[PDB]
Design a protein around this ligand. Structure first.
Ligand code: NI
Ligand code: NI
Ligand code: NI
Ligand code: NI
Ligand code: NI
Ligand code: NI
Ligand code: NI
Ligand code: NI
Length: 203
């Protein structure tokens, strides 16, 4: 399986492991995973994480030739399991000083789900990006402003958590992937930049 390739100890994940628009796996609803987790599912969570670190540190990003990213779902890897990893860095201030906490969210989540949400919608102002997609796709991708979610980590401990702003978008986009939904499915068909009143635009 694709899975055996990805878990070899010496294998680092890169762009050639990411499948593309049209691979039929991108559109399936992913299988739930069970605990305690198999060695491969544990390992895959870390490789996935390690990839997002690698993809965000300026020189590996260069050695491995990666595009910057803040989340990755197992479907993008030809593996149809409910495993997403998220990694959203905080920024430096104007004086160059690193922030307090490195990340606003660093987690590999098993079986993630949205359990409730806000009635208000939000959309990133710069639109959304995807590694399985090589088209420029303009427009606002409309998501819930605020989400509550549960998920398990790799020890099987269950987590409940509320998110807003940008972290909320990113988890939402990753969860969609494990249900076969692509982002452009939430861009308005007639006008891509239509703004329903009250839609929150994050800049
Ligand atoms: Ni590879
Ligand atoms: Ni481990
Ligand atoms: Ni590394
Ligand atoms: Ni500061
Ligand atoms: Ni609902
Ligand atoms: Ni994506
Ligand atoms: Ni619950
Ligand atoms: Ni705990």
């Amino acid at each position: 399986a694709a899975i055996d390739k990805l878990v070899k100890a010496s294998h680092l994940i890169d762009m050639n492991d990411i499948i593309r628009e049209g691979n039929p796996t991108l559109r399936k609803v992913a299988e739930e995973v069970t605990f305690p987790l198999s060695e491969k599912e544990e390992i895959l969570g870390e490789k996935m994480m390690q990839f997002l670190k690698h993809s965000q540190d300026p020189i590996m990003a260069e050695k491995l030739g990666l595009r910057g990213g803040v989340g990755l779902a197992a479907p993008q890897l030809d593996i149809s399991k409910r495993i997403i990893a998220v990694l959203v860095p905080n920024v430096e201030d104007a004086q160059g000083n690193p922030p307090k906490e490195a990340y606003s969210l660093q987690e590999v989540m098993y079986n993630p789900k949205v359990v409730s949400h806000s009635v208000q919608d939000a959309a990133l102002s710069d639109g959304e990006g995807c590694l399985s997609v090589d088209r420029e796709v303009p427009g606002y991708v409309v998501r819930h402003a605020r989400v509550t979610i549960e998920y398990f980590d790799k020890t099987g401990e269950k987590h409940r958590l509320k998110l807003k702003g940008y972290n909320s978008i990113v988890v939402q986009h990753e969860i969609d992937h494990i249900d076969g939904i692509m982002f452009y499915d939430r861009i308005n068909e007639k006008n891509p930049f239509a703004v329903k009143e009250g839609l929150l635009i994050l800049e």
